[PDB]
PDB file of all heavy atoms in Angstrom:
ATOM      1  N   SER A   2      65.309  83.566  85.727  1.00 21.13           N
ATOM      2  CA  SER A   2      65.656  83.043  87.045  1.00 21.13           C
ATOM      3  C   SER A   2      65.447  81.536  86.978  1.00 21.13           C
ATOM      4  O   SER A   2      64.331  81.058  87.192  1.00 21.13           O
ATOM      5  CB  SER A   2      64.809  83.674  88.139  1.00 21.13           C
ATOM      6  OG  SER A   2      63.432  83.462  87.897  1.00 21.13           O
ATOM      7  N   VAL A   3      66.511  80.802  86.680  1.00 21.06           N
ATOM      8  CA  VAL A   3      66.424  79.350  86.595  1.00 21.06           C
ATOM      9  C   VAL A   3      66.233  78.768  87.987  1.00 21.06           C
ATOM     10  O   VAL A   3      66.939  79.129  88.936  1.00 21.06           O
ATOM     11  CB  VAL A   3      67.668  78.775  85.894  1.00 21.06           C
ATOM     12  CG1 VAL A   3      68.927  79.238  86.578  1.00 21.06           C
ATOM     13  CG2 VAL A   3      67.604  77.263  85.893  1.00 21.06           C
ATOM     14  N   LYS A   4      65.270  77.854  88.114  1.00 24.39           N
ATOM     15  CA  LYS A   4      64.835  77.412  89.435  1.00 24.39           C
ATOM     16  C   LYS A   4      65.889  76.540  90.103  1.00 24.39           C
ATOM     17  O   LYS A   4      66.468  76.921  91.123  1.00 24.39           O
ATOM     18  CB  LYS A   4      63.509  76.653  89.330  1.00 24.39           C
ATOM     19  CG  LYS A   4      62.292  77.462  88.886  1.00 24.39           C
ATOM     20  CD  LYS A   4      62.529  78.964  88.819  1.00 24.39           C
ATOM     21  CE  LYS A   4      61.233  79.693  88.498  1.00 24.39           C
ATOM     22  NZ  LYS A   4      61.457  81.043  87.910  1.00 24.39           N
ATOM     23  N   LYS A   5      66.156  75.370  89.537  1.00 24.38           N
ATOM     24  CA  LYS A   5      67.139  74.443  90.085  1.00 24.38           C
ATOM     25  C   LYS A   5      68.458  74.685  89.363  1.00 24.38           C
ATOM     26  O   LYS A   5      68.528  74.614  88.132  1.00 24.38           O
ATOM     27  CB  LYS A   5      66.657  72.997  89.959  1.00 24.38           C
ATOM     28  CG  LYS A   5      66.294  72.537  88.555  1.00 24.38           C
ATOM     29  CD  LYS A   5      67.382  71.662  87.968  1.00 24.38           C
ATOM     30  CE  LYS A   5      66.947  71.069  86.646  1.00 24.38           C
ATOM     31  NZ  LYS A   5      67.983  70.163  86.083  1.00 24.38           N
ATOM     32  N   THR A   6      69.493  75.020  90.127  1.00 23.85           N
ATOM     33  CA  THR A   6      70.764  75.430  89.543  1.00 23.85           C
ATOM     34  C   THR A   6      71.917  74.631  90.119  1.00 23.85           C
ATOM     35  O   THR A   6      72.990  75.186  90.376  1.00 23.85           O
ATOM     36  CB  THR A   6      71.016  76.908  89.795  1.00 23.85           C
ATOM     37  OG1 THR A   6      71.476  77.083  91.138  1.00 23.85           O
ATOM     38  CG2 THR A   6      69.745  77.688  89.618  1.00 23.85           C
ATOM     39  N   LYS A   7      71.710  73.332  90.314  1.00 24.36           N
ATOM     40  CA  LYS A   7      72.644  72.509  91.063  1.00 24.36           C
ATOM     41  C   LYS A   7      73.207  71.331  90.284  1.00 24.36           C
ATOM     42  O   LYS A   7      74.090  70.643  90.803  1.00 24.36           O
ATOM     43  CB  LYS A   7      71.975  71.984  92.341  1.00 24.36           C
ATOM     44  N   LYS A   8      72.729  71.064  89.066  1.00 25.12           N
ATOM     45  CA  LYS A   8      73.171  69.854  88.368  1.00 25.12           C
ATOM     46  C   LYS A   8      74.530  70.031  87.689  1.00 25.12           C
ATOM     47  O   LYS A   8      75.554  69.574  88.206  1.00 25.12           O
ATOM     48  CB  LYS A   8      72.096  69.421  87.362  1.00 25.12           C
ATOM     49  CG  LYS A   8      71.549  70.527  86.454  1.00 25.12           C
ATOM     50  CD  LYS A   8      71.144  69.962  85.095  1.00 25.12           C
ATOM     51  CE  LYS A   8      70.630  71.036  84.136  1.00 25.12           C
ATOM     52  NZ  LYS A   8      71.679  71.577  83.218  1.00 25.12           N
ATOM     53  N   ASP A   9      74.567  70.774  86.583  1.00 24.79           N
ATOM     54  CA  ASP A   9      75.757  70.938  85.753  1.00 24.79           C
ATOM     55  C   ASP A   9      75.613  72.272  85.041  1.00 24.79           C
ATOM     56  O   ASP A   9      74.574  72.526  84.423  1.00 24.79           O
ATOM     57  CB  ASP A   9      75.924  69.834  84.694  1.00 24.79           C
ATOM     58  CG  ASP A   9      76.405  68.508  85.253  1.00 24.79           C
ATOM     59  OD1 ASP A   9      75.776  67.968  86.182  1.00 24.79           O
ATOM     60  OD2 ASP A   9      77.363  67.943  84.691  1.00 24.79           O
ATOM     61  N   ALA A  10      76.646  73.113  85.109  1.00 21.94           N
ATOM     62  CA  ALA A  10      76.560  74.439  84.503  1.00 21.94           C
ATOM     63  C   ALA A  10      77.958  74.986  84.276  1.00 21.94           C
ATOM     64  O   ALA A  10      78.664  75.287  85.243  1.00 21.94           O
ATOM     65  CB  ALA A  10      75.751  75.379  85.392  1.00 21.94           C
ATOM     66  N   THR A  11      78.348  75.136  83.010  1.00 19.85           N
ATOM     67  CA  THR A  11      79.650  75.699  82.642  1.00 19.85           C
ATOM     68  C   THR A  11      79.472  76.456  81.330  1.00 19.85           C
ATOM     69  O   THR A  11      79.319  75.837  80.272  1.00 19.85           O
ATOM     70  CB  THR A  11      80.719  74.618  82.501  1.00 19.85           C
ATOM     71  OG1 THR A  11      80.251  73.586  81.624  1.00 19.85           O
ATOM     72  CG2 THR A  11      81.098  74.017  83.854  1.00 19.85           C
ATOM     73  N   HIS A  12      79.499  77.788  81.398  1.00 17.68           N
ATOM     74  CA  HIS A  12      79.362  78.643  80.218  1.00 17.68           C
ATOM     75  C   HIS A  12      78.050  78.349  79.484  1.00 17.68           C
ATOM     76  O   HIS A  12      78.026  77.846  78.361  1.00 17.68           O
ATOM     77  CB  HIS A  12      80.566  78.492  79.283  1.00 17.68           C
ATOM     78  CG  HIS A  12      81.781  79.237  79.739  1.00 17.68           C
ATOM     79  ND1 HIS A  12      81.989  80.569  79.451  1.00 17.68           N
ATOM     80  CD2 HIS A  12      82.850  78.839  80.467  1.00 17.68           C
ATOM     81  CE1 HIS A  12      83.135  80.957  79.978  1.00 17.68           C
ATOM     82  NE2 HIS A  12      83.677  79.927  80.601  1.00 17.68           N
ATOM     83  N   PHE A  13      76.958  78.659  80.177  1.00 20.50           N
ATOM     84  CA  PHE A  13      75.622  78.402  79.661  1.00 20.50           C
ATOM     85  C   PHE A  13      75.392  79.148  78.348  1.00 20.50           C
ATOM     86  O   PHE A  13      76.082  80.116  78.017  1.00 20.50           O
ATOM     87  CB  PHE A  13      74.569  78.802  80.695  1.00 20.50           C
ATOM     88  CG  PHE A  13      74.358  80.284  80.807  1.00 20.50           C
ATOM     89  CD1 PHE A  13      73.243  80.881  80.244  1.00 20.50           C
ATOM     90  CD2 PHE A  13      75.262  81.077  81.487  1.00 20.50           C
ATOM     91  CE1 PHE A  13      73.046  82.239  80.344  1.00 20.50           C
ATOM     92  CE2 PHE A  13      75.066  82.435  81.589  1.00 20.50           C
ATOM     93  CZ  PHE A  13      73.959  83.016  81.017  1.00 20.50           C
ATOM     94  N   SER A  14      74.396  78.686  77.599  1.00 18.25           N
ATOM     95  CA  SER A  14      74.175  79.122  76.230  1.00 18.25           C
ATOM     96  C   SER A  14      72.787  79.731  76.074  1.00 18.25           C
ATOM     97  O   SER A  14      71.893  79.523  76.895  1.00 18.25           O
ATOM     98  CB  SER A  14      74.344  77.948  75.259  1.00 18.25           C
ATOM     99  OG  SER A  14      75.464  77.155  75.606  1.00 18.25           O
ATOM    100  N   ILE A  15      72.615  80.483  74.987  1.00 20.10           N
ATOM    101  CA  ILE A  15      71.335  81.084  74.622  1.00 20.10           C
ATOM    102  C   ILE A  15      70.967  80.608  73.223  1.00 20.10           C
ATOM    103  O   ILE A  15      71.712  80.853  72.268  1.00 20.10           O
ATOM    104  CB  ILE A  15      71.380  82.618  74.671  1.00 20.10           C
ATOM    105  CG1 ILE A  15      72.103  83.091  75.922  1.00 20.10           C
ATOM    106  CG2 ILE A  15      69.980  83.190  74.658  1.00 20.10           C
ATOM    107  CD1 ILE A  15      72.502  84.526  75.860  1.00 20.10           C
ATOM    108  N   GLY A  16      69.820  79.931  73.103  1.00 20.73           N
ATOM    109  CA  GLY A  16      69.398  79.389  71.827  1.00 20.73           C
ATOM    110  C   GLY A  16      68.412  80.283  71.098  1.00 20.73           C
ATOM    111  O   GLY A  16      67.826  81.203  71.664  1.00 20.73           O
ATOM    112  N   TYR A  17      68.211  79.977  69.816  1.00 18.40           N
ATOM    113  CA  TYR A  17      67.424  80.840  68.936  1.00 18.40           C
ATOM    114  C   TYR A  17      66.683  79.983  67.922  1.00 18.40           C
ATOM    115  O   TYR A  17      67.266  79.051  67.361  1.00 18.40           O
ATOM    116  CB  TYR A  17      68.329  81.847  68.235  1.00 18.40           C
ATOM    117  CG  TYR A  17      67.596  83.000  67.606  1.00 18.40           C
ATOM    118  CD1 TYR A  17      66.830  83.858  68.376  1.00 18.40           C
ATOM    119  CD2 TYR A  17      67.672  83.233  66.241  1.00 18.40           C
ATOM    120  CE1 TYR A  17      66.156  84.917  67.808  1.00 18.40           C
ATOM    121  CE2 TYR A  17      67.004  84.290  65.660  1.00 18.40           C
ATOM    122  CZ  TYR A  17      66.246  85.130  66.451  1.00 18.40           C
ATOM    123  OH  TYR A  17      65.571  86.187  65.886  1.00 18.40           O
ATOM    124  N   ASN A  18      65.404  80.299  67.693  1.00 16.87           N
ATOM    125  CA  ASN A  18      64.526  79.515  66.817  1.00 16.87           C
ATOM    126  C   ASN A  18      64.469  78.050  67.238  1.00 16.87           C
ATOM    127  O   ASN A  18      64.165  77.172  66.424  1.00 16.87           O
ATOM    128  CB  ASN A  18      64.936  79.639  65.348  1.00 16.87           C
ATOM    129  CG  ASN A  18      64.238  80.787  64.648  1.00 16.87           C
ATOM    130  OD1 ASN A  18      63.086  81.102  64.944  1.00 16.87           O
ATOM    131  ND2 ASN A  18      64.937  81.425  63.716  1.00 16.87           N
ATOM    132  N   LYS A  19      64.801  77.789  68.506  1.00 18.48           N
ATOM    133  CA  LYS A  19      64.720  76.477  69.140  1.00 18.48           C
ATOM    134  C   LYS A  19      65.799  75.531  68.623  1.00 18.48           C
ATOM    135  O   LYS A  19      66.032  74.470  69.210  1.00 18.48           O
ATOM    136  CB  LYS A  19      63.326  75.874  68.921  1.00 18.48           C
ATOM    137  CG  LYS A  19      63.024  74.590  69.678  1.00 18.48           C
ATOM    138  CD  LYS A  19      63.320  74.700  71.160  1.00 18.48           C
ATOM    139  CE  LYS A  19      62.524  73.648  71.919  1.00 18.48           C
ATOM    140  NZ  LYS A  19      62.321  73.977  73.356  1.00 18.48           N
ATOM    141  N   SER A  20      66.488  75.911  67.552  1.00 19.94           N
ATOM    142  CA  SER A  20      67.482  75.012  66.983  1.00 19.94           C
ATOM    143  C   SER A  20      68.734  75.689  66.444  1.00 19.94           C
ATOM    144  O   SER A  20      69.583  74.988  65.888  1.00 19.94           O
ATOM    145  CB  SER A  20      66.831  74.172  65.874  1.00 19.94           C
ATOM    146  OG  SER A  20      66.141  74.995  64.950  1.00 19.94           O
ATOM    147  N   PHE A  21      68.899  77.000  66.579  1.00 21.80           N
ATOM    148  CA  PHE A  21      69.997  77.658  65.885  1.00 21.80           C
ATOM    149  C   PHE A  21      70.586  78.751  66.762  1.00 21.80           C
ATOM    150  O   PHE A  21      70.115  79.010  67.871  1.00 21.80           O
ATOM    151  CB  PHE A  21      69.534  78.252  64.551  1.00 21.80           C
ATOM    152  CG  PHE A  21      69.107  77.229  63.547  1.00 21.80           C
ATOM    153  CD1 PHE A  21      67.779  77.114  63.177  1.00 21.80           C
ATOM    154  CD2 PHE A  21      70.033  76.377  62.974  1.00 21.80           C
ATOM    155  CE1 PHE A  21      67.380  76.171  62.250  1.00 21.80           C
ATOM    156  CE2 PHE A  21      69.642  75.433  62.047  1.00 21.80           C
ATOM    157  CZ  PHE A  21      68.313  75.330  61.683  1.00 21.80           C
ATOM    158  N   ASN A  22      71.656  79.362  66.248  1.00 20.83           N
ATOM    159  CA  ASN A  22      72.106  80.694  66.649  1.00 20.83           C
ATOM    160  C   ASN A  22      72.360  80.780  68.156  1.00 20.83           C
ATOM    161  O   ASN A  22      71.633  81.437  68.902  1.00 20.83           O
ATOM    162  CB  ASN A  22      71.106  81.766  66.204  1.00 20.83           C
ATOM    163  CG  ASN A  22      71.532  83.162  66.612  1.00 20.83           C
ATOM    164  OD1 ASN A  22      72.713  83.503  66.559  1.00 20.83           O
ATOM    165  ND2 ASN A  22      70.574  83.967  67.055  1.00 20.83           N
ATOM    166  N   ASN A  23      73.389  80.059  68.597  1.00 20.32           N
ATOM    167  CA  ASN A  23      73.854  80.289  69.956  1.00 20.32           C
ATOM    168  C   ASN A  23      74.232  81.760  70.099  1.00 20.32           C
ATOM    169  O   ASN A  23      75.279  82.192  69.607  1.00 20.32           O
ATOM    170  CB  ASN A  23      75.035  79.380  70.288  1.00 20.32           C
ATOM    171  CG  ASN A  23      75.259  79.247  71.773  1.00 20.32           C
ATOM    172  OD1 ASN A  23      74.392  79.588  72.571  1.00 20.32           O
ATOM    173  ND2 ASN A  23      76.429  78.753  72.154  1.00 20.32           N
ATOM    174  N   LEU A  24      73.391  82.530  70.796  1.00 20.77           N
ATOM    175  CA  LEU A  24      73.478  83.988  70.737  1.00 20.77           C
ATOM    176  C   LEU A  24      74.671  84.523  71.514  1.00 20.77           C
ATOM    177  O   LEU A  24      75.470  85.294  70.970  1.00 20.77           O
ATOM    178  CB  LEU A  24      72.196  84.624  71.273  1.00 20.77           C
ATOM    179  CG  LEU A  24      70.881  84.439  70.524  1.00 20.77           C
ATOM    180  CD1 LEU A  24      70.151  83.211  71.005  1.00 20.77           C
ATOM    181  CD2 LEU A  24      70.020  85.672  70.710  1.00 20.77           C
ATOM    182  N   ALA A  25      74.796  84.144  72.783  1.00 20.62           N
ATOM    183  CA  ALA A  25      75.888  84.613  73.629  1.00 20.62           C
ATOM    184  C   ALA A  25      76.328  83.464  74.523  1.00 20.62           C
ATOM    185  O   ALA A  25      75.554  82.991  75.362  1.00 20.62           O
ATOM    186  CB  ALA A  25      75.467  85.826  74.455  1.00 20.62           C
ATOM    187  N   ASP A  26      77.557  83.000  74.321  1.00 21.35           N
ATOM    188  CA  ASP A  26      78.206  82.014  75.181  1.00 21.35           C
ATOM    189  C   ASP A  26      79.477  82.672  75.705  1.00 21.35           C
ATOM    190  O   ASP A  26      80.569  82.463  75.169  1.00 21.35           O
ATOM    191  CB  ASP A  26      78.498  80.718  74.389  1.00 21.35           C
ATOM    192  CG  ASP A  26      78.553  79.487  75.270  1.00 21.35           C
ATOM    193  OD1 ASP A  26      79.129  79.565  76.376  1.00 21.35           O
ATOM    194  OD2 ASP A  26      78.026  78.436  74.852  1.00 21.35           O
ATOM    195  N   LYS A  27      79.331  83.468  76.763  1.00 21.40           N
ATOM    196  CA  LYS A  27      80.435  84.277  77.259  1.00 21.40           C
ATOM    197  C   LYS A  27      80.529  84.309  78.778  1.00 21.40           C
ATOM    198  O   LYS A  27      81.587  84.661  79.308  1.00 21.40           O
ATOM    199  CB  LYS A  27      80.305  85.712  76.707  1.00 21.40           C
ATOM    200  CG  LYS A  27      81.425  86.674  77.069  1.00 21.40           C
ATOM    201  CD  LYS A  27      81.381  87.919  76.196  1.00 21.40           C
ATOM    202  CE  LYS A  27      79.961  88.426  76.009  1.00 21.40           C
ATOM    203  NZ  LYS A  27      79.374  88.902  77.290  1.00 21.40           N
ATOM    204  N   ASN A  28      79.480  83.916  79.491  1.00 21.52           N
ATOM    205  CA  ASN A  28      79.446  83.998  80.945  1.00 21.52           C
ATOM    206  C   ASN A  28      80.058  82.739  81.544  1.00 21.52           C
ATOM    207  O   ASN A  28      79.623  81.624  81.242  1.00 21.52           O
ATOM    208  CB  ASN A  28      78.004  84.185  81.424  1.00 21.52           C
ATOM    209  CG  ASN A  28      77.887  84.296  82.933  1.00 21.52           C
ATOM    210  OD1 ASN A  28      77.505  83.339  83.604  1.00 21.52           O
ATOM    211  ND2 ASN A  28      78.194  85.469  83.469  1.00 21.52           N
ATOM    212  N   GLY A  29      81.076  82.921  82.383  1.00 24.69           N
ATOM    213  CA  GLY A  29      81.719  81.798  83.035  1.00 24.69           C
ATOM    214  C   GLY A  29      81.155  81.555  84.416  1.00 24.69           C
ATOM    215  O   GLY A  29      81.777  80.885  85.246  1.00 24.69           O
ATOM    216  N   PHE A  30      79.960  82.083  84.664  1.00 25.72           N
ATOM    217  CA  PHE A  30      79.298  81.981  85.954  1.00 25.72           C
ATOM    218  C   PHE A  30      78.124  81.026  85.829  1.00 25.72           C
ATOM    219  O   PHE A  30      77.654  80.749  84.722  1.00 25.72           O
ATOM    220  CB  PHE A  30      78.791  83.350  86.440  1.00 25.72           C
ATOM    221  CG  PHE A  30      79.865  84.250  86.992  1.00 25.72           C
ATOM    222  CD1 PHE A  30      79.732  85.626  86.907  1.00 25.72           C
ATOM    223  CD2 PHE A  30      80.993  83.731  87.598  1.00 25.72           C
ATOM    224  CE1 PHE A  30      80.704  86.467  87.413  1.00 25.72           C
ATOM    225  CE2 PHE A  30      81.975  84.571  88.105  1.00 25.72           C
ATOM    226  CZ  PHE A  30      81.826  85.939  88.012  1.00 25.72           C
ATOM    227  N   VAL A  31      77.657  80.523  86.964  1.00 26.15           N
ATOM    228  CA  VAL A  31      76.457  79.694  87.029  1.00 26.15           C
ATOM    229  C   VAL A  31      75.299  80.568  87.503  1.00 26.15           C
ATOM    230  O   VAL A  31      75.445  81.275  88.510  1.00 26.15           O
ATOM    231  CB  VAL A  31      76.654  78.481  87.951  1.00 26.15           C
ATOM    232  CG1 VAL A  31      77.050  78.912  89.357  1.00 26.15           C
ATOM    233  CG2 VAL A  31      75.380  77.660  88.011  1.00 26.15           C
ATOM    234  N   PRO A  32      74.169  80.584  86.803  1.00 26.74           N
ATOM    235  CA  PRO A  32      72.982  81.249  87.343  1.00 26.74           C
ATOM    236  C   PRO A  32      72.497  80.548  88.601  1.00 26.74           C
ATOM    237  O   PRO A  32      72.686  79.345  88.786  1.00 26.74           O
ATOM    238  CB  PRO A  32      71.960  81.134  86.206  1.00 26.74           C
ATOM    239  CG  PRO A  32      72.452  80.019  85.360  1.00 26.74           C
ATOM    240  CD  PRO A  32      73.941  80.059  85.451  1.00 26.74           C
ATOM    241  N   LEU A  33      71.874  81.321  89.484  1.00 25.37           N
ATOM    242  CA  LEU A  33      71.463  80.813  90.784  1.00 25.37           C
ATOM    243  C   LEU A  33      69.947  80.722  90.883  1.00 25.37           C
ATOM    244  O   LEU A  33      69.204  81.221  90.033  1.00 25.37           O
ATOM    245  CB  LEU A  33      72.014  81.683  91.915  1.00 25.37           C
ATOM    246  CG  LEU A  33      73.532  81.788  91.956  1.00 25.37           C
ATOM    247  CD1 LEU A  33      73.944  83.147  92.471  1.00 25.37           C
ATOM    248  CD2 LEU A  33      74.095  80.685  92.832  1.00 25.37           C
ATOM    249  N   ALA A  34      69.500  80.064  91.947  1.00 28.36           N
ATOM    250  CA  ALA A  34      68.083  79.791  92.136  1.00 28.36           C
ATOM    251  C   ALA A  34      67.330  81.076  92.447  1.00 28.36           C
ATOM    252  O   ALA A  34      67.785  81.895  93.250  1.00 28.36           O
ATOM    253  CB  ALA A  34      67.887  78.778  93.264  1.00 28.36           C
ATOM    254  N   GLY A  35      66.180  81.248  91.801  1.00 27.13           N
ATOM    255  CA  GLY A  35      65.316  82.384  92.060  1.00 27.13           C
ATOM    256  C   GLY A  35      66.003  83.726  91.973  1.00 27.13           C
ATOM    257  O   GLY A  35      65.592  84.671  92.652  1.00 27.13           O
ATOM    258  N   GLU A  36      67.030  83.838  91.142  1.00 29.54           N
ATOM    259  CA  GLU A  36      67.856  85.032  91.074  1.00 29.54           C
ATOM    260  C   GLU A  36      67.582  85.759  89.770  1.00 29.54           C
ATOM    261  O   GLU A  36      67.506  85.140  88.706  1.00 29.54           O
ATOM    262  CB  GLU A  36      69.338  84.675  91.181  1.00 29.54           C
ATOM    263  CG  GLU A  36      70.239  85.841  91.498  1.00 29.54           C
ATOM    264  CD  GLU A  36      69.865  86.521  92.790  1.00 29.54           C
ATOM    265  OE1 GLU A  36      69.395  85.828  93.716  1.00 29.54           O
ATOM    266  OE2 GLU A  36      70.037  87.754  92.877  1.00 29.54           O
ATOM    267  N   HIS A  37      67.429  87.074  89.857  1.00 28.53           N
ATOM    268  CA  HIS A  37      67.120  87.857  88.673  1.00 28.53           C
ATOM    269  C   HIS A  37      68.396  88.240  87.937  1.00 28.53           C
ATOM    270  O   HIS A  37      69.246  88.959  88.466  1.00 28.53           O
ATOM    271  CB  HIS A  37      66.330  89.100  89.060  1.00 28.53           C
ATOM    272  CG  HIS A  37      65.128  88.805  89.903  1.00 28.53           C
ATOM    273  ND1 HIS A  37      63.939  88.356  89.370  1.00 28.53           N
ATOM    274  CD2 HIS A  37      64.935  88.883  91.240  1.00 28.53           C
ATOM    275  CE1 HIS A  37      63.064  88.174  90.342  1.00 28.53           C
ATOM    276  NE2 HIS A  37      63.643  88.488  91.486  1.00 28.53           N
TER     277      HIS A  37
END
């Protein structure tokens, strides 16, 4: 649940080992505030 969701968001990413492996870049939605 990302807290502030108002700056910039287009096809958010999932990182791995802090530097590699963009796991899933498929959602064309913006996550919302306090949302599960």
Side-chain angles (χ1 to χ4, degrees), residues 2-6 8-37:
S2 58
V3 55
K4 294 351 185 202
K5 56 103 173 182
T6 78
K8 48 149 182 95
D9 285 55
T11 52
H12 282 275
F13 76 104
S14 318
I15 316 165
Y17 196 61
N18 270 326
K19 188 51 158 202
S20 51
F21 294 111
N22 179 39
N23 199 15
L24 294 90
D26 207 319
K27 183 165 42 65
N28 181 258
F30 283 151
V31 57
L33 301 147
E36 196 58 33
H37 308 280

